[PDB]
């Protein structure tokens with residue numbers, strides 16, 4: 348689809364069989380989701396944002412479905428204020444900016 | 447133009463006479479530029495994201511040119527790690543996400 352930005356570009360995603368709302372975020376290198384249980388192994392990681400750094404759990408090769416498009420890649424889980432879909436997955440679904 | 451997301455979507459902007467590189471960020475409500483000495487009145491403001499909040503100065507009705515496209519709105523200034531063009535100005539240049 349084509350999405351304008353008069354409001355936040357929120358979309359429904361599916362991860363681990365659960366539905367969630369997430370923000371299509373061109374300003375994020377990485378994808379960061381609020382605290383949740385995911386299968387598979389995980390390793391601690393740090394990521395930095397506008398206000399500083401937070402501790403996250405890095406899950407690799409996780410399947411996520413974004414508006415019906417499938418992606419499999421790195422998902423960070425931690426105390427982010429909003430579920431954000433970053434460029435690592437936006438590229439997998441073929442997302443571009445246009446103006 | 448069309449901007450892919452393999453790398454950070456950085457573009458040249460023109461503000462208050464100066465040229466700068468800024469991130470086109472669909473995940474930002476607002477536009478924040480690193481510390482610069484703009485003239486006129488301002489109001490204090492706090493903006494937040496991953497990691498917490500930073501204190502910025504809010505300037506109203508500032509002109510910014512983004513790859514030849516002009517926009518006028520609120521521009522925040524403070525200790526941001528990166529210059530960020532947010533939705534308040536991206537809507538004005540007709541920017542969309544497309545996949």
Ligand SMILES: COC(=O)N[C@H](C(=O)N[C@@H](Cc1ccccc1)[C@@H](O)C[C@H](Cc1ccccc1)NC(=O)O[C@H]1CO[C@H]2OCC[C@H]21)C1CCCC1
Nearest residue numbers: 374375376377396397429473474475476478494495496530
């Ligand atoms: C209403 O609240 C807002 O609008 N918050 C805006 C805001 O923080 N938006 C976030 C997404 C978001 C939206 C709501 C709540 C929490 C997070 C991103 O879009 C922009 C930041 C910019 C950034 C880039 C580099 C270093 C530091 C910062 N990317 C980000 O943190 O990315 C992380 C993940 O991936 C890693 O790559 C980059 C760095 C890592 C601010 C921005 C300026 C105006 C408000």
